[PDB]
Amino acid sequence: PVATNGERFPWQELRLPSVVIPLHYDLFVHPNLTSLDFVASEKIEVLVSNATQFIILHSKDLEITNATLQSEEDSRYMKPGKELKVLSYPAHEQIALLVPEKLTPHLKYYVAMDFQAKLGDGFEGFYKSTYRTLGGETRILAVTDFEPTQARMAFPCFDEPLFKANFSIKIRRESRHIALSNMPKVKTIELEGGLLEDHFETTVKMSTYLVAYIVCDFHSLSGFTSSGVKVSIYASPDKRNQTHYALQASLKLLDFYEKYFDIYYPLSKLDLIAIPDFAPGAMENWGLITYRETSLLFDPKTSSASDKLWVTRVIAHELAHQWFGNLVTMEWWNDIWLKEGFAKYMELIAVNATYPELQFDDYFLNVCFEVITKDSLNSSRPISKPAETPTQIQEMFDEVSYNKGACILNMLKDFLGEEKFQKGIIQYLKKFSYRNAKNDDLWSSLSNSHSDPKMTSNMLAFLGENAEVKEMMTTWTLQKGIPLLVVKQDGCSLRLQQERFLQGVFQEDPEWRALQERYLWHIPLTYSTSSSNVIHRHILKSKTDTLDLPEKTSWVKFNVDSNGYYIVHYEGHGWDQLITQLNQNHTLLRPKDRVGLIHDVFQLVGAGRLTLDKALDMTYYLQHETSSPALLEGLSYLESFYHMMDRRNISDISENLKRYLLQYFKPVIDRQSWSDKGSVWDRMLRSALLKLACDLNHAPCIQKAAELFSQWMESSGKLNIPTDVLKIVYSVGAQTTAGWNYLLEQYELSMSSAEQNKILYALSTSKHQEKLLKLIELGMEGKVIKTQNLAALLHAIARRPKGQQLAWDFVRENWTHLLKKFDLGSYDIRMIISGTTAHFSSKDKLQEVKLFFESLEAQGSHLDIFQTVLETITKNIKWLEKNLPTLRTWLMVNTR
């Protein structure tokens, strides 16, 4: 069970022993940004709760040269020796420290090692990044990213989030660099040869994955929150101007969170820094949050309204973590939604509260619809499941841990109301401050809202409704997928019935009965009727139940405003009824009810519970619809049918769609200005509508956009393009070897990585194979087009008909190289796989992908995303074979 030199490596489990608890780490790191390596040492104060001959902790890719143990309490180890024998077992990323004399329960010891490695080459542990300056200089910084399991690549440590400790960090550096870390800098002291050495205030108790340090030459803007925290935004010096909005938003959010959670942020400073090469979107390292440049930086001339909205989100997301994750931390990675689900959910409360004009409230339903796909497949997973190897732990970061977790919290908040929800939250955070919780600690704390309360008879429903709350959500976390609520209206008697919603699996399928087996949700229902817009609430705990309506009514609309994580079906006239209402007077349904009805109709076609012609019937009212969320939801289905047709050659149906979209909706498309004027939905509407018109080669749209591009190129950036149409204008621009060349050159020179983002997109809507592969080759290189951007580039290329095949060929014929740059469980490889295959909709393509996935399990590689893809290409094939002629005739009928 053992190896390396020989010898029995004394520990066997992948998890660490719990006999040696860490308490304080003295960490000294000395990096050199010229030799691109580092030297380092640590002293770890541990407490032993059991007698042991050995200590076990993590360490990967680090060379260890000293190993001593000390104690002020165990004379045998009194200063300075002894020396420990060090035993390495890479397969478990562990090392063993072999103590000469079995240690003593309840006494403290001091472990000490010296370690060194090259600066990392990826996006892991202590790695190298580079940026360009305004003068075309290329500089180097060194930066940490640890989540989940890579602190162990920087320093040996008890590397599991339970082993919270205090950290005391010192860093050696040249005068041209600063050094940053979790905590403020107490001391710089100067040294012999002229080097400096920063001391940082000891951390509070905290998990290893959040420890951070950076050595760079960046610049900042600072400001102070209402409660005295110094917020600073760091970016490379030529981008200082782009940090203003981040400074403004962090202050108001950190304010908001202190008041909302009723718990001060504990450190004196909060730094946000924008790292040029950064794989995740951001990481919530306590006191030193790192960001993708596009998550943090903003610049009014090239960053759109959508951009701002994204930057605010990510900032609100990371600050939320300072309490959810850093303050209170998962016991282990199985319950990782405990922090990502909550940070995600809190983007909504905090951004709604601090920036209501961003209208983020209306964008939150998209987070939940986006996860209802995926979750309507059998390859889904529950929100908490066991996970033990590092890849599986990385795999826990997906739309389920984040989106779905945030969505069911929203459900529960709507049930208990905001006050009891906030109160529950505050108690969760206050109670596990500086330690760890699991699922059940949350549910207990969310249910519970001389003596504290007054005694009553009504008290029994306060102790029993509380127990209901806990019983409820354990079904939402331990069960994969989402419930279909099927309503039958006949009389003033409504029959209720829950199934597991399945897509590409119809009510009468040979595989349907098994997949439906043991599933049952405590679904907190809501609804309203045509009579009174008054919400009623009932809790369907059983596979069957019924309700009497206090009147007769035209229609019943379940799932008010879509606060609930379920789809609704109406048997009988229900669908005919509600659609009629939408056709005649649509404003007698609340806007979010509309968004939901549109959503659910199209989702139910997929499930075979409804014919496509009935969905397509509902979209007719969109000619009258001015609520942008519902109008854009609606359009999005028509726009995806088109691209799906376009992706096959099915050009008779595609051309009909193009005509129905430009004809119907011709008025709304035509009110659109090529400007940045109006509200945020106003501008979300404008970019959408114009993008659609130039995708469908509308002659006005293509000509306006093409003009702006010449005006722009022939002034070499002088006259300027309103942000909301920037991406359109550039991509129409890219349709010639001239524009595309110019744009590629503008990419290298630009200093808005949000502009770069729009340019590289535009560049991928070209039709020449040569251009698309060039984009990819560059992407591999990592010089022109950074490798952090490759996965999204392949995705953009594959999305479009001319690039479908190329992206596929490339992913297969270059798989080995792809993996040298990213971990198998990285969001990069997940997206590279998925983005190049999941839109495929034919028996042929399904075959090839089945083969390419098989081969990857010849070699040592398994991911869930394999089944999920195949289940999505299958879902697609059925959709076409079971709905396509209905779409063909509904258009033809319509042309008539």
């Binding site: 989540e147 995740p280 979107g281 951001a282 990481m283 919530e284 993708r292 596009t294 994204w310 990510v314 997301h317 973590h321 994750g325 990782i336 922090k339 990502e340 940070a343 970061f397 984040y402 996965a791 999204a792 969001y827």
Partner: peptide
């Protein structure tokens, strides 16, 4: 967390 990119 993230995670993602956009």
């Amino acid at each position: 967390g993230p995670g993602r990119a956009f």
